[PDB]
Amino acid sequence: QGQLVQSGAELKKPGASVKISCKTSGYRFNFYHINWIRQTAGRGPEWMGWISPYSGDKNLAPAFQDRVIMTTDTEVPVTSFTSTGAAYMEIRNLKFDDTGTYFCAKGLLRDGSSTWLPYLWGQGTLLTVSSASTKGPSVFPLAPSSKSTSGGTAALGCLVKDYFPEPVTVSWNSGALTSGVHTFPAVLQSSGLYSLSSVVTVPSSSLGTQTYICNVNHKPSNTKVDKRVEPKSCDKGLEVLF
Amino acid sequence: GIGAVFLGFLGAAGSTMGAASMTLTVQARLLLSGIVQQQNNLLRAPEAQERMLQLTVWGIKQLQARVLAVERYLGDQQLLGIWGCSGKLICCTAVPWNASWSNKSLDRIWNNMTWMEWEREIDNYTSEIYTLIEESQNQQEKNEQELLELD
Amino acid sequence: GIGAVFLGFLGAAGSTMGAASMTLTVQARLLLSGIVQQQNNLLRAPEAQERMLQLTVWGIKQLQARVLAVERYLGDQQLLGIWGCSGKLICCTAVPWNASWSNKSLDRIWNNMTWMEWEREIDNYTSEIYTLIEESQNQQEKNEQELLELD
Amino acid sequence: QVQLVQSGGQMKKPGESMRISCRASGYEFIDCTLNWIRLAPGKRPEWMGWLKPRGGAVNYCRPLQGRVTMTRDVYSDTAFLELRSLTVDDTAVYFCTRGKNCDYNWDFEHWGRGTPVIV
Amino acid sequence: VLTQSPGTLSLSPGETAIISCRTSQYGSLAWYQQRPGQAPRLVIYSGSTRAAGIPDRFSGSRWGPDYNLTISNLESGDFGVYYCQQYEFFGQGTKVQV
Amino acid sequence: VEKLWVTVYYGVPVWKEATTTLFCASDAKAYDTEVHNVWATHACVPTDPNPQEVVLENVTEHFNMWKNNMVEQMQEDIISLWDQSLKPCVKLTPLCVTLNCKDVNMERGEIKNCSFNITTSIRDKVQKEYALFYKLDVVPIDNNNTSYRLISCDTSVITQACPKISFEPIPIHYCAPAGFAILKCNDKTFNGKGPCKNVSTVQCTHGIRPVVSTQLLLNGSLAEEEVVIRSDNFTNNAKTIIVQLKESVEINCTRPNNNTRKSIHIGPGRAFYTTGEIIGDIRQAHCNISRAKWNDTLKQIVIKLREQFENKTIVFNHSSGGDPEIVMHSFNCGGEFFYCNSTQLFNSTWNNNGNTITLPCRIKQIINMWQEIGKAMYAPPIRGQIRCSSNITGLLLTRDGCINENGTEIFRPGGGDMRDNWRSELYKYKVVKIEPLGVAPTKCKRRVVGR
Ligand SMILES: *[C@@H]1O[C@H](CO)[C@@H](O[C@@H]2O[C@H](CO)[C@@H](O[C@@H]3O[C@H](CO[C@H]4O[C@H](CO[C@H]5O[C@H](CO)[C@@H](O)[C@H](O)[C@@H]5O)[C@@H](O)[C@H](O[C@H]5O[C@H](CO)[C@@H](O)[C@H](O)[C@@H]5O)[C@@H]4O)[C@@H](O)[C@H](O[C@H]4O[C@H](CO)[C@@H](O)[C@H](O)[C@@H]4O[C@H]4O[C@H](CO)[C@@H](O)[C@H](O)[C@@H]4O[C@H]4O[C@H](CO)[C@@H](O)[C@H](O)[C@@H]4O)[C@@H]3O)[C@H](O)[C@H]2NC(C)=O)[C@H](O)[C@H]1NC(C)=O
Ligand SMILES: *[C@@H]1O[C@H](CO)[C@@H](O[C@@H]2O[C@H](CO)[C@@H](O[C@@H]3O[C@H](CO[C@H]4O[C@H](CO)[C@@H](O)[C@H](O[C@H]5O[C@H](CO)[C@@H](O)[C@H](O)[C@@H]5O[C@H]5O[C@H](CO)[C@@H](O)[C@H](O)[C@@H]5O)[C@@H]4O)[C@@H](O)[C@H](O[C@H]4O[C@H](CO)[C@@H](O)[C@H](O)[C@@H]4O[C@H]4O[C@H](CO)[C@@H](O)[C@H](O)[C@@H]4O)[C@@H]3O)[C@H](O)[C@H]2NC(C)=O)[C@H](O)[C@H]1NC(C)=O
Ligand SMILES: *[C@@H]1O[C@H](CO)[C@@H](O[C@@H]2O[C@H](CO)[C@@H](O[C@@H]3O[C@H](CO[C@H]4O[C@H](CO[C@H]5O[C@H](CO)[C@@H](O)[C@H](O)[C@@H]5O)[C@@H](O)[C@H](O[C@H]5O[C@H](CO)[C@@H](O)[C@H](O)[C@@H]5O)[C@@H]4O)[C@@H](O)[C@H](O[C@H]4O[C@H](CO)[C@@H](O)[C@H](O)[C@@H]4O)[C@@H]3O)[C@H](O)[C@H]2NC(C)=O)[C@H](O)[C@H]1NC(C)=O
Ligand SMILES: *[C@@H]1O[C@H](CO)[C@@H](O[C@@H]2O[C@H](CO)[C@@H](O[C@@H]3O[C@H](CO[C@H]4O[C@H](CO[C@H]5O[C@H](CO)[C@@H](O)[C@H](O)[C@@H]5O[C@H]5O[C@H](CO)[C@@H](O)[C@H](O)[C@@H]5O)[C@@H](O)[C@H](O[C@H]5O[C@H](CO)[C@@H](O)[C@H](O)[C@@H]5O)[C@@H]4O)[C@@H](O)[C@H](O)[C@@H]3O)[C@H](O)[C@H]2NC(C)=O)[C@H](O)[C@H]1NC(C)=O
Ligand SMILES: *[C@@H]1O[C@H](CO)[C@@H](O[C@@H]2O[C@H](CO)[C@@H](O[C@@H]3O[C@H](CO)[C@@H](O)[C@H](O[C@H]4O[C@H](CO)[C@@H](O)[C@H](O)[C@@H]4O)[C@@H]3O)[C@H](O)[C@H]2NC(C)=O)[C@H](O)[C@H]1NC(C)=O
Ligand SMILES: *[C@@H]1O[C@H](CO)[C@@H](O[C@@H]2O[C@H](CO)[C@@H](O[C@@H]3O[C@H](CO)[C@@H](O)[C@H](O)[C@@H]3O)[C@H](O)[C@H]2NC(C)=O)[C@H](O)[C@H]1NC(C)=O
Ligand SMILES: *[C@@H]1O[C@H](CO)[C@@H](O[C@@H]2O[C@H](CO)[C@@H](O[C@@H]3O[C@H](CO)[C@@H](O)[C@H](O)[C@@H]3O)[C@H](O)[C@H]2NC(C)=O)[C@H](O)[C@H]1NC(C)=O
Ligand SMILES: *[C@@H]1O[C@H](CO)[C@@H](O[C@@H]2O[C@H](CO)[C@@H](O)[C@H](O)[C@H]2NC(C)=O)[C@H](O)[C@H]1NC(C)=O
Ligand SMILES: *[C@@H]1O[C@H](CO)[C@@H](O[C@@H]2O[C@H](CO)[C@@H](O)[C@H](O)[C@H]2NC(C)=O)[C@H](O)[C@H]1NC(C)=O
Ligand SMILES: *[C@@H]1O[C@H](CO)[C@@H](O)[C@H](O)[C@H]1NC(C)=O
Ligand SMILES: *[C@@H]1O[C@H](CO)[C@@H](O)[C@H](O)[C@H]1NC(C)=O
Ligand SMILES: *[C@@H]1O[C@H](CO)[C@@H](O)[C@H](O)[C@H]1NC(C)=O
Ligand SMILES: *[C@@H]1O[C@H](CO)[C@@H](O)[C@H](O)[C@H]1NC(C)=O
Ligand SMILES: *[C@@H]1O[C@H](CO)[C@@H](O)[C@H](O)[C@H]1NC(C)=O
Ligand SMILES: *[C@@H]1O[C@H](CO)[C@@H](O)[C@H](O)[C@H]1NC(C)=O
């Protein structure tokens, strides 16, 4: 009946600090535990620890018992039955393998066997740890190319190249376009950079009626560059439709 | 420990339904006599003007509310009677749990919801529920009778 | 069917003693709380002048009758207590049936007479009957005591 | 049912003082709050101020402050409105109203009656 | 502070009209209507809610800075001038005629 | 699960928002010493020595001071006591005689020396008697001859409150009945309306001194952390803004005149008391307060006023209008009712970029609290001089709802209605009805697999 949100991708370097908080909604923050689980590709989704926002009792993993320390803020009630609150987990003396998609997770019950075990899950904000610099996603368009000449479509999308670090997100017409959404993730070259793209589905008959633009952005670089696909082109499957 | 120590009136207001299930006596007491103990005791202070100048403005405020407290209390004791269980606190019935009232399961009912919270989610059906227990008694009351005749 | 469906207050007034033996809850309820449910519910209408100008002419008519209803009710609950059976509705005793009260047989008592009719034919002896049950308890109350001493 | 009525035609020269009536019935006069409006022809309906009839507590708008004088008399259930230093600006007809309930005054459900004024 | 748009407001009995009103801060909305001889008549007391003697035609409808009052199926009693009120403030208002 | 069954529970921790006739608790040192008559205090029960309260864990109740019936109950009570206590007291109805008033020697004739003929305990003596009156307490007739009449004699029923009684504000607790409960907001800074966090159950409230003032809040409770401001809606310019001080500012006041009691017996077994004379100098009543304390207090207010409003600069002003009750700081001091002219305390503009205050006061004797139906009360004069000291604990403001360019936002002393006096203290609390019966499923049948 509620939902949880977290701290965005905070790029840091090996041998540093990184803080990751979690804020609640639609439920009594004090009534439930707050767990912490990452997604280390080499080890697996390792559980870090939970803490009671009411009793202040903890149970950290002996792996990071000395390393990490947890803490919570006060609860801010919305109604007589719901509230909002904050919780934390900072880790120092970092290494390389302290990485992955990081989840906060509210408990299941207020009492019982499976008290602390998580039911509701957070966003999952990815975290990388390296000493290298950071590069911005230079956005550019692509020369249109149809998917099917039988049906009659005019596919078009924007291209991102040489960015670091993940994640990057795309929304069309500033959240004013619903159907026909298609995206995909990136991969690391021999050099050491991630790169992705996007794509949409519209007909080739009505071209200059509706207008679409990709609102691309990136949290660590702090930019929101936008682009538009140039329709003037010559391919193999799109010239048959014109 | 926890169930054999002190708690206080209405203490488990925000405690699970299971938790509250120990601290009934706390809120099962003082429904009446919470005030008649205190009133009789505190009112026999050396005043000697209890009800002087006959009855006054506080005269009715109390009696209009004194006479309420008991019938209000005797209303819940009349339900215990008419449901055949004035053992109070806890009592089982033949009336089964219509999941139409709450599809939810046992585990979470007693260990996550609280009674304030629960009685709300079930408020609308209570009327129909309560009437089922009365018709559960009378089936039993006739079945008792039938056997009183032949033995 | 008939015992598991609706009937209504005082419905079995002219029904046999056996018939009425199912519809007790109907007239065992509302002895009290028949009015305290309705009063509290209907009186919280948006008036905001409950007991305005202190108490009035309807002021005492109710309270003189409110305070009656409960002691009148608590009188019958005091009998259930003093006869050792507040299970209500139906309860057996060791007091046997003195045929001097009614020589008649079982068959016709439950299937031809009605309670209004019956309690009349037995009205005069009820005083002596009721006093027999009280002395039936106290024999049992001493017999209980005697055994509390030695074990 | 809560009736309302005022005075009528009263002509005056600029730079003078005036006074009008506003009788009312149907409620505990002192419990519910009242107010006035300087509804101008063509212009926006200008609010003048409100009055609590129990104690006589009032509140006035700046353009009318000093000039306006809201009064009452529970012995007659009649709210008065005095206005000195007259101009062409304030020549329009006035109207005394009360809210739908005492709980909220600004929901004017009950209004006054025509009161011609000439300058 | 209230911006009651728009101003012209002349149509036939067989039509529909919608009057808008804008504000900076929040508040309790209301609406009125003047007549020949008569004074302003209340028609809305919360926004969604209607006053006494008001059919389903009077549709109040928008949770946002723009609030509007619609009175479809026009008639001859509808002629006059309307205003939007929020607390002590009033709207510019608008006159509809024959 | 299993074959689950309804099972019923008596004694569950459940309540609902409710209203019901409360009852009052007295104080031990209050009842014991006689103090003769005092309100209806004697008819209450005594408060429990043990101030018992239980804190409720894991609850966050909703409180809204504005819709709280304890104050619709409080004033209901407060009026009822007065009427009934003055029920037996002496009626001044025949004193409506033409008062031939000469004045005595703020010099317009505030104290006036008047004569009149009355019939005594007995109908065989029209005794021409002379007595003193206040300029407010009296009103002239036709041309200003030497003739006056009592302020509301023709239109009301004036009743001389017996001197045996006292108006001393004894604190009071509202003890709740059985099957009910009164909750508290145990927070420091509570808005007034909205959800609570630190909540608890009490049997009775804290001691509510039923003082009745008209502009400033006296002898009440102070704020806990920092001063707070409370209103239903601030845009609702027709809504009283209640302020609660953190530091109470002591205000000393006095009627400097040493008066002499004079019993004129209208009879048969009753007399009308008045000031026979004035032993010494003739002086003016007033109230002293440190202007440093007061305006440094006004600093507390503005910063928390700027929180509800924009950082726009603020201005204070004298009351726009109303009865002397509202337009002036009115209160009782030693048995006599004051009306201090509060222009001084409310005339200031607080922006961003020594001595003391002496407020003049008038004494009225014929008064009408709660503005009743042709029902007035004559407080007899108190012997000698009187000097009392109140703590300003807060006050009431009223905004001018016509925002201006210069402006900027004006706040004058409110105090038309009396229901806020009680809200100012009873905000902390709320009443609920306990409902101990509750049904819940647990796998258990009613043991009738055999009979
Ligand atoms: C906010 O809170 C503050 C703080 O509470 C409020 O301020 C308080 O206000 C109340 C009342 O408004 C005041 O209480 C009254 O005080 C007066 C005067 O005080 C007397 O006592 C002083 C010393 O205290 C002694 O007595 C107390 C008990 O009273 C005792 O506990 C203590 O140990 C000590 O023994 C004296 O200093 C004082 O002045 C004397 O000395 C002066 C020179 O130093 C001189 O100039 C004076 O003239 C005087 O000689 C004075 O003696 C009390 O009079 C009053 O008590 C009256 O009322 C009760 C109840 O009815 C009654 O039992 C008393 O006997 C008395 O009533 C009779 O006596 C009066 C004269 O004493 C007389 O004027 C009355 O008319 C009345 O007369 C009737 O009875 C007599 C027989 O007794 C009979 O012969 C007559 O015919 C007639 O029938 C109260 O105690 C607080 O003092 C005051 N506190 C402070 C700090 O200021 C403030 O008001 C609150 N704000 C609001 C808005 O409410
Ligand atoms: C049983 O017996 C009872 C007896 O009590 C009967 O009932 C009573 O009858 C009384 C008379 O029959 C009645 O008392 C009077 O009512 C007057 C009604 O007001 C009309 O007239 C005024 C002018 O006097 C006028 O202003 C009013 O309205 C005008 O303005 C409105 C504004 O919206 C217009 O809508 C309206 O059309 C009208 O004219 C305007 O518009 C037209 C166009 O339509 C223009 O052409 C005009 O130029 C104008 O602009 C009403 O029309 C009431 O006014 C009387 O009170 C005034 O007069 C007395 C003295 O006569 C005075 O003391 C008052 O203070 C008040 O004076 C004010 O007006 C004066 C001008 O006359 C002015 O000089 C003053 O300065 C003041 O401003 C008077 O009260 C009484 O109400 C009823 N009682 C009840 C309960 O109904 C009953 O009928 C009998 N029953 C039977 C069965 O027999
Ligand atoms: C208000 O609401 C809140 C939130 O809804 C509510 O808090 C819940 O309360 C319930 C009931 O008390 C809790 O449910 C229990 O949880 C127990 C889990 O905590 C145990 O384990 C902790 C870890 O200790 C290990 O690790 C440390 C180092 O990490 C090591 O030193 C230890 O040796 C151990 O290895 C431990 O710290 C904790 O300690 C409790 O007790 C000590 C005293 O012994 C006390 O000082 C602490 O403050 C703390 O309370 C505890 O031992 C769990 O064990 C327990 O399970 C029992 O009961 C269930 C069913 O009841 C059975 O299934 C099970 O077999 C056991 O019998 C039970 O599940 C729940 O965790 C709370 N949740 C939160 C978020 O706080 C409040 O009670 C509410 N308050 C009111 C008044 O209503
Ligand atoms: C019993 O006592 C009552 C109350 O005391 C008397 O009630 C009055 O009854 C009469 C009945 O006729 C009413 O008289 C009306 O007066 C109208 C004209 O009044 C105008 O002039 C007044 C003159 O007063 C000035 O002079 C005196 C000293 O001579 C000063 O004290 C006073 O302050 C005034 O000084 C200013 O003005 C002069 C010029 O006159 C300057 O030179 C000075 O420098 C000062 O600037 C004046 O007082 C009036 O003020 C009133 O009106 C203005 C608005 O214009 C308002 O703002 C004021 O606050 C004030 O209300 C006014 O200017 C006359 O036209 C009319 O026909 C009528 O005769 C009078 O209104 C009643 N007063 C009240 C308060 O109700 C009663 O007379 C008395 N009876 C007996 C028998 O003794
Ligand atoms: C508090 O609020 C008040 C009311 O809104 C606000 O009012 C203004 O006060 C000034 C005073 O600085 C007024 O100016 C004059 O004040 C003197 C007293 O100082 C009066 O005697 C004047 O009235 C007489 O004289 C006028 C001609 O000079 C006549 O026209 C008049 O009829 C009188 O005979 C005069 O009022 C000013 O008029 C008012 N403004 C209004 C609209 O009333 C004051 O500024 C506020 N102050 C603070 C600190 O908040
Ligand atoms: C409340 O609970 C009672 C039982 O305690 C319900 O009565 C029973 O309801 C079922 C329908 O759910 C009836 O029909 C049977 O259903 C199953 C599948 O659901 C099917 O296999 C059977 O062949 C048959 O269809 C069942 O006859 C009925 N029992 C009686 C004695 O009538 C009742 O419906 C519940 N009511 C509510 C409002 O929840
Ligand atoms: C009420 O019932 C009791 C029994 O429950 C009656 O007591 C018993 O009454 C009989 C007389 O009817 C006593 O005597 C015996 O009678 C039979 C024949 O009737 C005879 O065979 C025996 O030899 C003997 O005569 C019997 O002793 C007596 N029991 C006791 C314990 O005293 C009682 O009389 C009834 N009273 C009324 C008013 O009906
Ligand atoms: C200093 O005070 C001035 C007022 O004298 C403040 O100006 C106000 O600023 C708010 C926004 O913060 C506006 O909404 C008001 O309209 C402004 N009023 C005026 C009269 O200018 C100013 O913000 C204050 N500055 C600080 C830093 O407190
Ligand atoms: C605030 O400043 C304004 C001017 O900016 C002053 O406004 C004048 O107010 C008087 C009424 O007292 C009007 O007659 C004038 O027409 C106004 N002039 C202007 C230019 O608006 C106002 O007096 C100032 N307020 C204070 C308290 O000084
Ligand atoms: C009960 O049914 C509702 C849908 O009506 C569902 O959302 C809810 O999860 C169900 N609860 C359980 C415990 O299955
Ligand atoms: C108990 O769990 C249900 C869903 O399993 C949830 O809707 C409800 O809010 C929970 N109760 C509390 C107090 O969180
Ligand atoms: C319970 O009944 C009330 C009417 O008293 C209704 O408003 C409410 O929606 C009902 N509950 C649910 C969950 O629909
Ligand atoms: C009971 O006794 C009476 C005579 O006293 C007799 O008429 C009646 O028939 C008897 N009843 C039965 C059932 O034997
Ligand atoms: C029951 O039968 C008896 C005789 O057997 C008779 O006296 C009595 O009147 C009958 N009851 C009714 C209701 O007819
Ligand atoms: C003041 O009035 C009184 C009234 O009796 C008079 O005796 C006295 O002389 C007056 N004072 C002066 C200074 O005239």
Automatic annotation (TrEMBL), chains B, C:
UniProt signal peptide: none
Segments passing through the bilayer: 1-22
Domain named Retroviral envelope protein GP41-like: residues: 17-151
Glycosylation sites: 98, 103, 112, 124
Record's subcellular location: Host cell membrane; Host endosome membrane; Virion membrane
Disulfide pairings: 85-91
Assembly behavior: The mature envelope protein (Env) consists of a homotrimer of non-covalently associated gp120-gp41 heterodimers. The resulting complex protrudes from the virus surface as a spike. There seems to be as few as 10 spikes on the average virion. Interacts with host CD4, CCR5 and CXCR4. Gp120 also interacts with the C-type lectins CD209/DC-SIGN and CLEC4M/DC-SIGNR (collectively referred to as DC-SIGN(R)). Gp120 and gp41 interact with GalCer.
Protein name: Envelope glycoprotein gp160
Organism per entry: Human immunodeficiency virus type 1 (HIV-1)
UniProt gene name: env
Boundaries of the shown chain within the full protein: 505 to 655 of 847
Automatic annotation (TrEMBL), chain F:
The keyword Chaperone is assigned to this record: no
Region annotation (V2) ranges: 114-153
Sequence segments annotated as region (CD4-binding loop): 319-329
Annotated segments matching region V5: 404-414
Assembly: The mature envelope protein (Env) consists of a homotrimer of non-covalently associated gp120-gp41 heterodimers. The resulting complex protrudes from the virus surface as a spike. There seems to be as few as 10 spikes on the average virion. Interacts with host CD4, CCR5 and CXCR4. Gp120 also interacts with the C-type lectins CD209/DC-SIGN and CLEC4M/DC-SIGNR (collectively referred to as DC-SIGN(R)). Gp120 and gp41 interact with GalCer. The mature envelope protein (Env) consists of a homotrimer of non-covalently associated gp120-gp41 heterodimers. The resulting complex protrudes from the virus surface as a spike. There seems to be as few as 10 spikes on the average virion. Surface protein gp120 interacts with host CD4, CCR5 and CXCR4. Gp120 also interacts with the C-type lectins CD209/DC-SIGN and CLEC4M/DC-SIGNR (collectively referred to as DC-SIGN(R)). Gp120 and gp41 interact with GalCer.
Its biological purpose: Surface protein gp120: Attaches the virus to the host lymphoid cell by binding to the primary receptor CD4. This interaction induces a structural rearrangement creating a high affinity binding site for a chemokine coreceptor like CXCR4 and/or CCR5. Acts as a ligand for CD209/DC-SIGN and CLEC4M/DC-SIGNR, which are respectively found on dendritic cells (DCs), and on endothelial cells of liver sinusoids and lymph node sinuses. These interactions allow capture of viral particles at mucosal surfaces by these cells and subsequent transmission to permissive cells.
Protein name per UniProt: Envelope glycoprotein gp160
Species of provenance: Human immunodeficiency virus type 1
Gene transcribed to yield this protein: env
